[PDB]
Design a protein around this ligand. Structure first.
Ligand SMILES: Cc1cc2nc3c(=O)[nH]c(=O)nc-3n(C[C@H](O)[C@H](O)[C@H](O)COP(=O)(O)O)c2cc1C
Length: 138
């Protein structure tokens, strides 16, 4: 499996690593990929796209890198299962509610409730691992 993410301070990166840990504990292989290094063709071969990005701008996806990536794959993912996650700060998930609506609008099947954690995981570390386990159980 693959996990593609954007992280500005490492909070979403930590989430990505914990989600990976959960998938691995479930017995499956998974690679975590920073959005700057993503191979689009290889990502599209996956049965489940696990995508993560923190809340940026005013409740939007990161603009220089993550956003363009979503735009590029947008027309090539109808029917694909996707799992979404990200870290946030002062809000309550607006950017993620929009991210979920967006992917649904592209015809994706959002497999689990998006995982959102405030700042660095910490107490929420297990929540990250468990989200990975849910994805692996599909
Ligand atoms: C310029 C900027 C904009 C942000 N916009 C939001 C926002 O609209 N809502 C929110 O809850 N947090 C927002 N945050 C907070 C980040 O989402 C939060 O610090 C998160 O833990 C960052 O994760 P990361 O290290 O993976 O980037 C913003 C942070 C920055 C740097």
């Amino acid at each position: 499996m693959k996990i593609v993410y954007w992280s500005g301070t490492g909070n979403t990166e930590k989430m990505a690593e914990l989600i990976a840990k959960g998938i691995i504990e479930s017995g499956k292989d998974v690679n975590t990929i920073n959005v700057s290094d993503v191979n689009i063709d290889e990502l599209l071969n996956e049965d489940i796209l696990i995508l993560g990005c923190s809340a940026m701008g005013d409740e939007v996806l990161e603009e220089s890198e993550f956003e363009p990536f979503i735009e590029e794959i947008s027309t090539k993912i109808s029917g694909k299962k996707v799992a979404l996650f990200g870290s946030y700060g002062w809000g309550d998930g607006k950017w993620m509610r929009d991210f979920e609506e967006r992917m649904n609008g592209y015809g994706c099947v959002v497999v689990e409730t998006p995982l959102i954690v405030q700042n660095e995981p910490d107490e929420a570390e297990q929540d990250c691992i468990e989200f990975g386990k849910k994805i692996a159980a599909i």
